Amino acid sequence: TNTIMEQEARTAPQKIAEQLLANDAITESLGSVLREFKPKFVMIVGRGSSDHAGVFAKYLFEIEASIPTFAAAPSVASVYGKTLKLAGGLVIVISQSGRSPDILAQARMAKNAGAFCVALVNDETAPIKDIVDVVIPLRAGEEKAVAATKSYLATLSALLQVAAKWTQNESLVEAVNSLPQALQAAVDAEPQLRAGSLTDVKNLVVLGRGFGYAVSKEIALKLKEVCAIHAEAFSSAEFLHGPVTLVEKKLSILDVCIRDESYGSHVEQIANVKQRGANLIHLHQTSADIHPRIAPLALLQRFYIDVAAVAIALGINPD
Template identity: 60%
Template sequence: MNSTIMAQEAAEAPQRIREQLAANSSTITTIVQQIGKRAPKYVYMVGRGSSDHAGVFAKYLIEIELGLPVVAAAPSIASVYHKQLQLQDALVLVISQSGRSPDILAQVEMAKAAGAYVVALVNDTSSPLAEQADAVVPLFVGPEKAVAATKSYLATLSALLQLVALWSAQPQLLAAVESLPALLEQAQQLPAQLTPASVATVKHGVVLGRGPGYAIAREIALKLKEVCGIHAEAFSSAEFLHGPVTLVKDQFAIIDVSVADEALAAHKAQVTEVQNRGAAVVQLNHGALTSHPRVLPLLVLQRFYLDVEAVARSRGVNPDAPPGLNKVTKTV
């Protein structure tokens, strides 16, 4: 039996996503029809923390599969600086588990005032965000009690995948999304990759990925900080070579997030270069599991969530309630 709430919730993800995909099919079909009528010229992503990292995944996913530019919001533009942006040609995607942070709600108000079509991906469908958005994609993960998001983050990525698969009318991608719950269950059975021994002496490190792999590298770095107390920063493996690589000395810790997609060869070459400079590398991947390359990052993340929980316990940290953190964070 899993020993913490975090581990239990991470293990729930496949079943929750199975239920989500079935429940949201008609909802997302309707949203796609509305998007088609409005023909947005770009996508404006709104989110904080893990939700912002999900937005980075959405950026790669939408730009690769639909060719539509995606830009990230600076939430304080509306809430602190009180500025109105010209968003009338935008599809606004807002991601939040709680749907209650004032800065996120201010973005929705601003976007609607501009005439944008606002779609919220939210777990709490009774929240102000769900009430204010033009359309809602429920995450359907149920209560998430551990401070660190796991099942809700994976469910956000699966909802984005279902949206893009239907929007882009790609049967192969949609079939891969529908097979995702079974793949996540298989990912849970992969051998541990991030182990207590592999990061026993690590206090600082870098998480490297490329494309959608970089998007989940940001989430992995956040979890290493908030759950384990390890200072970790995420970089695109290409970007890391443009200056930050000078940080690498003997046994500098690198977490290598490898996804078998179009960027894999370049990513591996870049990781090899930093390894040759003396970095100690921990590899995270999806093992022998195969599918459409856009769903593979979720398999890496599923295994990682179980691993990072075990690492936290090995360090004497309660992963359900890391010190100084609250489940719902409200910022302006």
């Protein structure tokens, strides 16, 4: 494919390699601040792909750092005019552009309530840098495609590095170091999502569990954004509590399979909706040696290239 989306997606391994080297000192310093600060919770501020990145941070910081983590509801402030008690907590503002006024207004509120504030932004110069305490630059470069690809993976890579520095888990440190090579391997692997599966498919469900669910939300957003498919992401545990009735009528399901602690639970539910008659399409990791916490990113890196081709086959310009 010759779209901006695919071209930008293919630069993600090398954009991240430069990011991990360039940010090593920044995130090394931040991890010690967090080890001293000992945040009571982490609140994520962002929209769209950045908000989905925050769902990844929830699983990351709760599993790896034991810190309760969640997403802000911007309307609480911008519509209802309320402040939250955020003293003793960490606020992470995620924004590729980093200049939208809604985003800046919530950063000011978070700082005014006593939170330690960090921003993950692609433009380090934007005025958000004057509000927050620490800026971690995404270093993804300009994103010209409508669909975020590299800027999302660079958000995850920054979150993983902050997590590796903060917790100091050496296993997680090696996974972050292996990220560029793992992503490059994903780019070179064979396609998984093929357009023939998605012909005449107006809506579908993306099923995942754990980190795989967090990446499902981003896959679901991309299916909407570049394929005009009404795709909705569910945890495979949550799907059984009502939504599974849609499998009684024809339903396509995109299965996000991650080889981590969640695998056992997740495959049990994939078998169930399969017996119930759903048309499964299986996404999985791209190489055998990939660390479980990094496997979600490689799956997405592969999906980004494959979904660009699916968009073209459906007559949509993903850009």
